[PDB]
């Protein structure tokens, strides 16, 4: 089945607040990115032959070029100011629970799971401790799972042969928390 | 502070469909319903903090419609392949028997941005208590999308997310069952 898609993305990149902004507009026709506008360059640049005509045409209109370069402030910085009031500071504390499983053959237990869900933003730290010593190896993770509704979830597992008397602790550090969250097992 | 605001828009033929939306660090801020000409916030609470004038987005789409025709003519026999999606199914949060939860059907890395998604419970289509997002942008040229199903956890039921896409031989079905 033949399909035709005119698709564009206008990406506003921020480094340390609106201290350094960079606008990057990308044009695609079906599966090919054919042209782009990098604010750090100041003008359109064809990515493939199919995008040359537009670079040639648009680049020769000083009035229009001036307008795009200004979007770094008229659009990027302008919108960041708005979003900095509710999206940048969004914080949702995670729900942390620990529980054992098998995974392998059976008898006893070999996997300790630290489940961290329903949190935001995405940067988070999950550590495992065995009687006070941080377990660096034997860690298996599902990775940062994005739910699509502005919340994340993840599992961080420790592979172990539990010896009665040993206390395991899952420690979670996250921006929404004033103090590390810990759960023992 | 590292952040990224992506504004994405497109027009697709022959389906004759357009889209205009904003993304913040990977999550949808809002999109414009083209037909109804209105702003739809991904999270209700967002509306009290900002606003958008939809007609501006509709104008942009009109320009994309026009440009697509130029692009078709400019490439001549530009038609090509497509990318089948990866599909995954997982629960929103920890599942506990009897406690209502939500199944998430994650459709990733595909194009064109068109799909047929069906939720199945014990092999039957479910159309109540379901929802979805529009076509979301990725770092590359492909799209991603989320479908949701509300459900009552049970040890004897099973679920499936059925996804059909032009890049697939036959419709794809990903399975999900509860486990304690």
């Amino acid at each position: 089945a033949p399909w035709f898609l005119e698709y564009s993305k206008s990406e506003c990149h921020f480094y340390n607040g609106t201290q350094r902004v960079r606008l990057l507009v990308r044009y695609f026709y079906n599966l090919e990115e054919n042209l782009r506008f990098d604010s750090d360059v100041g003008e359109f640049r064809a990515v493939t032959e199919l995008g040359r005509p537009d670079a040639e045409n648009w680049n020769s209109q000083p009035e229009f070029l001036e307008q795009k370069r200004a979007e770094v402030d008229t659009v990027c910085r302008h919108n960041y100011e708005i979003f900095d009031n509710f999206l940048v500071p969004r914080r949702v504390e995670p729900t942390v629970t620990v529980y054992p499983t098998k995974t392998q053959p059976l008898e006893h237990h070999n996997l300790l799971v630290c489940s961290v869900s329903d949190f935001y933003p995405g940067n988070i730290e999950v550590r495992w401790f065995r009687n006070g010593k941080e377990e660096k190896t034997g860690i298996v993770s599902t990775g940062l799972v994005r739910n699509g509704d502005w919340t994340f979830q993840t599992l961080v597992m420790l592979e172990t042969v539990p010896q009665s008397g040993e206390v395991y602790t899952c420690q979670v550090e996250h921006p929404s928390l004033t103090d590390p969250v810990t759960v023992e097992w | 502070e590292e952040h990224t605001i992506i504004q994405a828009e497109f027009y697709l033929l022959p389906d004759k469909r357009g889209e205009f939306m904003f993304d913040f660090d990977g999550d949808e801020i809002f999109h414009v319903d083209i037909e109804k000409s209105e702003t739809i916030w991904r999270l209700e609470e967002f509306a009290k903090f900002a606003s958008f004038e939809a007609q501006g987005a509709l104008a942009n789409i009109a320009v994309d419609k026009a440009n697509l025709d130029v692009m078709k003519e400019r490439s001549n026999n530009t038609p090509d392949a497509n990318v089948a999606p990866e599909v995954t199914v997982l629960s929103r949060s920890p599942v506990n028997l009897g406690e209502p939860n939500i199944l998430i059907c994650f459709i990733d890395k595909f194009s064109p941005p068109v799909v047929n998604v069906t939720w199945l419970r014990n092999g039957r289509p479910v159309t109540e208590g379901v929802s979805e997002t529009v076509f979301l942008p990725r770092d590359d040229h492909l799209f991603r999308k989320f479908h949701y199903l509300t459900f009552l956890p049970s040890t004897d039921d099973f679920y499936d997310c059925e996804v059909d896409h032009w890049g697939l031989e036959e419709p794809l079905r990903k399975h999900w069952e509860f486990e304690e």
Binding site: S8, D54 | A50, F52
Partner: peptide
């Protein structure tokens, strides 16, 4: 509720 700006779309030939 401040107004979100959007980049303007350009026309091709």
């Amino acid at each position: 509720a401040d107004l979100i700006a959007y980049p303007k779309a350009a026309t091709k030939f």
